Amino acid sequence: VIGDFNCTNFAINDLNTTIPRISEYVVDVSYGLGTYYILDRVYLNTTILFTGYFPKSGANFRDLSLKGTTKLSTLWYQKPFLSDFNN
Amino acid sequence: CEYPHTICKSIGSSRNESWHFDKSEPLCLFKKNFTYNVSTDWLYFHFYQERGTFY
Amino acid sequence: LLKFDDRGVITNAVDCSSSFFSEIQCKTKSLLPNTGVYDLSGFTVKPVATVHRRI
Amino acid sequence: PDLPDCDIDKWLNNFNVPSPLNWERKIFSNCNFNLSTLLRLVHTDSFSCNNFDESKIYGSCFKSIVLDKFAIPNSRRSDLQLGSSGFLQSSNYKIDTTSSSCQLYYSLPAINVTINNYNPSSWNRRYGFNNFNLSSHSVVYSRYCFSVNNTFCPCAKPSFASSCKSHKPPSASCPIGTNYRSCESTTVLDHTDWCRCSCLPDPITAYDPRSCSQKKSLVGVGEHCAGFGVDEEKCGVLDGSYNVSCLCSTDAFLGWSYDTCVSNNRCNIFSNFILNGINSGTTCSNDLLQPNTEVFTDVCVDYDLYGITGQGIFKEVSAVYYNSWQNLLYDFNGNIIGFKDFVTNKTYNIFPCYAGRVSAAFHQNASSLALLYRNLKCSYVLNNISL
Numbered sequence: 185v186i187g188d189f190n191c192t193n194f195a196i197n198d199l200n201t202t203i204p205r206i207s208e209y210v211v212d213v214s215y216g217l218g219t220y221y222i223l224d225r226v227y228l229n230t231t232i233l234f235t236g237y238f239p240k241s242g243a244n245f246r247d248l249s250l251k252g253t254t255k256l257s258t259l260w261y262q263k264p265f266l267s268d269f270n271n
Numbered sequence: 272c273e274y275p276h277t278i279c280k281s282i283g284s285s286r287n288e289s290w291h292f293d294k295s296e297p298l299c300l301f302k303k304n305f306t307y308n309v310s311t312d313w314l315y316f317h318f319y320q321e322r323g324t325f326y
Numbered sequence: 327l328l329k330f331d332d333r334g335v336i337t338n339a340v341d342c343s344s345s346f347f348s349e350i351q352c353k354t355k356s357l358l359p360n361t362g363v364y365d366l367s368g369f370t371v372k373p374v375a376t377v378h379r380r381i
Numbered sequence: 382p383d384l385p386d387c388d389i390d391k392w393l394n395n396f397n398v399p400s401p402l403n404w405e406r407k408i409f410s411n412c413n414f415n416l417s418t419l420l421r422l423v424h425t426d427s428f429s430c431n432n433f434d435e436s437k438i439y440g441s442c443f444k445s446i447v448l449d450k451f452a453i454p455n456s457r458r459s460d461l462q463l464g465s466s467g468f469l470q471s472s473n474y475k476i477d478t479t480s481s482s483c484q485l486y487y488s489l490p491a492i493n494v495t496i497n498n499y500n501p502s503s504w505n506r507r508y509g510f511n512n513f514n515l516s517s518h519s520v521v522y523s524r525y526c527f528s529v530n531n532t533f534c535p536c537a538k539p540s541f542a543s544s545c546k547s548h549k550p551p552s553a554s555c556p557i558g559t560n561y562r563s564c565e566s567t568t569v570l571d572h573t574d575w576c577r578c579s580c581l582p583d584p585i586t587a588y589d590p591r592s593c594s595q596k597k598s599l600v601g602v603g604e605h606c607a608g609f610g611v612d613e614e615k616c617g618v619l620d621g622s623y624n625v626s627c628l629c630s631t632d633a634f635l636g637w638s639y640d641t642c643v644s645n646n647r648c649n650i651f652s653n654f655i656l657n658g659i660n661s662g663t664t665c666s667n668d669l670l671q672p673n674t675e676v677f678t679d680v681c682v683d684y685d686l687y688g689i690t691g692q693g694i695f696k697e698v699s700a701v702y703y704n705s706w707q708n709l710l711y712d713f714n715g716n717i718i719g720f721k722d723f724v725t726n727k728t729y730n731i732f733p734c735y736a737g738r739v740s741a742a743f744h745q746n747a748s749s750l751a752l753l754y755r756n757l758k759c760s761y762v763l764n765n766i767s768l
């Protein structure tokens with residue numbers, strides 16, 4: 185459903201094999217994980233605030249492991265792996 | 272394509288690298304290739320949009 | 327609250343919203359703030375949404 | 382911050398110059414380049430354009446950059462103009478005229494020159510073609526180019542090869558999906574068995590060009606030569622011994638010649654600047670004024686690097702501990718205090734220059750004024766205000 189053109193029409197099924205695996209490791213920004221360096225600004229020996237975009241801690245990672253072995257199903261598209269990329 | 276998929280460089284692949292219909296060269300806003308240290312163990316990404324500007 | 331070393335390397339970061347501890351930590355721009363009472367201005371109340379006023 | 386360049390100068394100054402039959406194709410997309418530095422670095426001689434001018438390049442941006450590169454023969458220089466009906470424009474390369482393009486004439490030294498000769502055809506190379514055994518610095522150029530169909534093999538059946546006692550035509554077995562010849566006997570008592578085939582004695586001058594398997598095909602834009610003319614009777618397995626496939630010798634092909642570029646110990650290489658997408662695109666020249674000059678101290682030189690505008694005195698301070706991507710450094714509040722150049726790997730500390738006031742005491746019974754510059758030295762005032 186993601187594409188808008190037809191390329192292949194063989195070895196296509198609708199078997200339920202999707203697994204929404206949820207990770208058991210929460211976001212830990214205490215060691216710099218998730219923090220991104222500023223595009224051009226650089227600070228030296230400074231502890232300044234930054235109203236940027238960082239991942240919220242206490243939220244477990246949502247794993248998206250998708251592969252294919254000579255067959256593919258249309259079920260992985262849309263729900264539940266494809267989510268609405270809001271911001 | 273309606274059913275996209277990518278191939279590997281190790282051993283073989285189930286299908287071929289054909290998930291679109293790019294028979295010519297399209298127009299891109301950022302097209303280049305960068306090499307990273309493959310010997311590492313982790314890799315972190317970040318993609319956020321602000322005022323219609325990608326990052 | 328990003329902390330930079332002498333070489334500009336990030337080591338510790340404060341969430342500012344994980345709990346009240348992060349708010350007190352980043353309120354005074356220090357990983358170990360001084361003692362005293364801290365009135366957390368901006369406490370989460372989790373209200374409801376109100377729309378479509380009727381005459 | 383700057384963007385990576387297209388490295389056009391590194392490609393135009395390549396020591397591996399190609400032959401006119403196989404011009405190198407290079408497309409540059411999403412990059413930048415400088416026309417002034419490119420023209421200054423290359424040993425250009427002339428610059429011409431079709432339906433365009435070099436003065437309009439500044440300001441307008443193109444979608445992509447398409448370039449051509451091939452050697453220029455010494456005896457084939459006067460026929461390089463547009464619209465000329467020479468041998469080069471008829472069977473080697475076609476120059477587009479309905480689109481905007483520019484012609485660049487630059488020269489390269491005779492030393493460190495390596496030629497590369499290879500025919501860009503399928504049937505020409507597949508039907509017994511070895512390497513181009515030519516001399517050094519030999520610029521090969523074709524004269525007549527012929528094309529064949531995808532179901533024609535330059536050979537015939539072995540049944541008719543043994544039917545001619547004298548001047549028999551050679552034949553072999555071509556792969557599937559191909560058609561044989563149409564040889565027939567025309568004995569008029571001149572010899573023992575006089576038999577002839579189609580396209581005789583040569584494909585260029587044939588009595589019946591309609592029945593010929595190969596015809597003269599004109600060269601087009603973005604398309605190399607279709608192959609040299611080859612005679613069907615001059616190639617093939619003799620007597621139909623059925624040893625190999627329908628393979629023909631290299632000497633059977635005709636319609637090409639070679640020349641040289643030795644002229645004042647230098648060789649000329651043509652360059653076609655094919656540009657598309659007028660005043661719209663991503664990759665184009667950026668020869669405008671940028672704040673990249675010889676910076677120096679002792680005066681608050683205006684700085685406009687990394688999208689930050691300010692006024693301050695530069696100071697040379699060694700700073701090697703910066704990261705591979707780090708270019709500046711900020712203070713506690715968040716203002717610029719310095720930067721680091723990306724072309725000379727030099728670091729500078731920005732110091733605000735003098736913008737203060739001056740105190741002047743005046744008395745009602747006096748005439749002059751007692752000027753007093755607070756927190757300043759007499760040498761600085763004398764060297765920065767007046768004598």
Ligand SMILES: CC(=O)N[C@H]1[C@H]([C@H](O)[C@H](O)COC(C)=O)O[C@@](O[C@H](CO)[C@@H](O)[C@@H]2O[C@@](O)(C(=O)O)C[C@H](O)[C@H]2NC(C)=O)(C(=O)O)C[C@@H]1O
Nearest residue numbers: 197198199201202203249250251252253254255256257285
């Ligand atoms: C997320 C998930 O559950 N992944 C499965 C994966 C998919 O179910 C399947 O490959 C996609 O194809 C469909 C839609 O059926 O299947 C794995 O097991 C295969 C089950 O078919 C396994 O038997 C593989 O089968 C092959 O026949 C093949 O190429 O399909 C041979 C292959 O060696 C074999 N793979 C092995 C042994 O690793 C899978 O592909 O691994 C199991 C995943 O967890």
Ligand SMILES: *[C@@H]1O[C@H](CO)[C@@H](O[C@@H]2O[C@H](CO)[C@@H](O)[C@H](O)[C@H]2NC(C)=O)[C@H](O)[C@H]1NC(C)=O
Nearest residue numbers: 198199200201202203204205206259260263264
């Ligand atoms: C496809 O299979 C998955 C795996 O069992 C199903 O997901 C389960 O759905 C039930 C019903 O809500 C839950 O109680 C389970 O916890 C789910 N398991 C997992 C691993 O997520 C899914 O419902 C199936 N889809 C269809 C259409 O049958």
Ligand SMILES: *[C@@H]1O[C@H](CO)[C@@H](O[C@@H]2O[C@H](CO)[C@@H](O)[C@H](O)[C@H]2NC(C)=O)[C@H](O)[C@H]1NC(C)=O
Nearest residue numbers: 227228229230231329330331332333334356713
């Ligand atoms: C980085 O910042 C810290 C925080 O101010 C500096 O530590 C101070 O250093 C001065 C001079 O050595 C002392 O008088 C202060 O007492 C220190 N503060 C604390 C809280 O210990 C540190 O010197 C700075 N480092 C660099 C290289 O500038």
Ligand SMILES: *[C@@H]1O[C@H](CO)[C@@H](O[C@@H]2O[C@H](CO)[C@@H](O)[C@H](O)[C@H]2NC(C)=O)[C@H](O)[C@H]1NC(C)=O
Nearest residue numbers: 305306307308309310311312313314315704705
């Ligand atoms: C690429 O990554 C590898 C692994 O992340 C780096 O190799 C490490 O180098 C350090 C430096 O002495 C050693 O202590 C580690 O034991 C090495 N690990 C491994 C797995 O070899 C390597 O240095 C990196 N290269 C670059 C250019 O960054």
Ligand SMILES: *[C@@H]1O[C@H](CO)[C@@H](O)[C@H](O)[C@H]1NC(C)=O
Nearest residue numbers: 188189190191192193194273
């Ligand atoms: C592919 O899509 C096009 C356009 O929707 C349609 O004309 C064509 O018939 C389709 N072909 C197949 C095999 O589905």
Ligand SMILES: *[C@@H]1O[C@H](CO)[C@@H](O)[C@H](O)[C@H]1NC(C)=O
Nearest residue numbers: 278283284285286287288289
């Ligand atoms: C990819 O295409 C080539 C050329 O048609 C073919 O030889 C090859 O087998 C294909 N590979 C797969 C995995 O289909």
Ligand SMILES: *[C@@H]1O[C@H](CO)[C@@H](O)[C@H](O)[C@H]1NC(C)=O
Nearest residue numbers: 302303304305306387388409
């Ligand atoms: C990377 O891009 C350059 C373009 O200049 C190209 O020449 C090169 O082949 C590319 N390499 C890979 C591995 O894609």
Ligand SMILES: *[C@@H]1O[C@H](CO)[C@@H](O)[C@H](O)[C@H]1NC(C)=O
Nearest residue numbers: 383386413414415667671673
């Ligand atoms: C052209 O040269 C100037 C001089 O420093 C430079 O600032 C500019 O980035 C260059 N433009 C390119 C390479 O496109």
Ligand SMILES: *[C@@H]1O[C@H](CO)[C@@H](O)[C@H](O)[C@H]1NC(C)=O
Nearest residue numbers: 395396490491492493494495
């Ligand atoms: C170019 O020629 C000069 C003089 O013959 C020689 O010193 C130099 O090494 C050559 N460079 C290359 C890349 O061949």
Ligand SMILES: *[C@@H]1O[C@H](CO)[C@@H](O)[C@H](O)[C@H]1NC(C)=O
Nearest residue numbers: 704705706723724725726727
């Ligand atoms: C400047 O520093 C970088 C970072 O290591 C290095 O790669 C580069 O060679 C240096 N010199 C120049 C001229 O960029």
Ligand SMILES: *[C@@H]1O[C@H](CO)[C@@H](O)[C@H](O)[C@H]1NC(C)=O
Nearest residue numbers: 742743744745746747748749
């Ligand atoms: C200024 O000069 C006049 C001239 O007579 C004198 O009367 C007056 O006292 C003077 N005032 C001062 C402040 O010197």
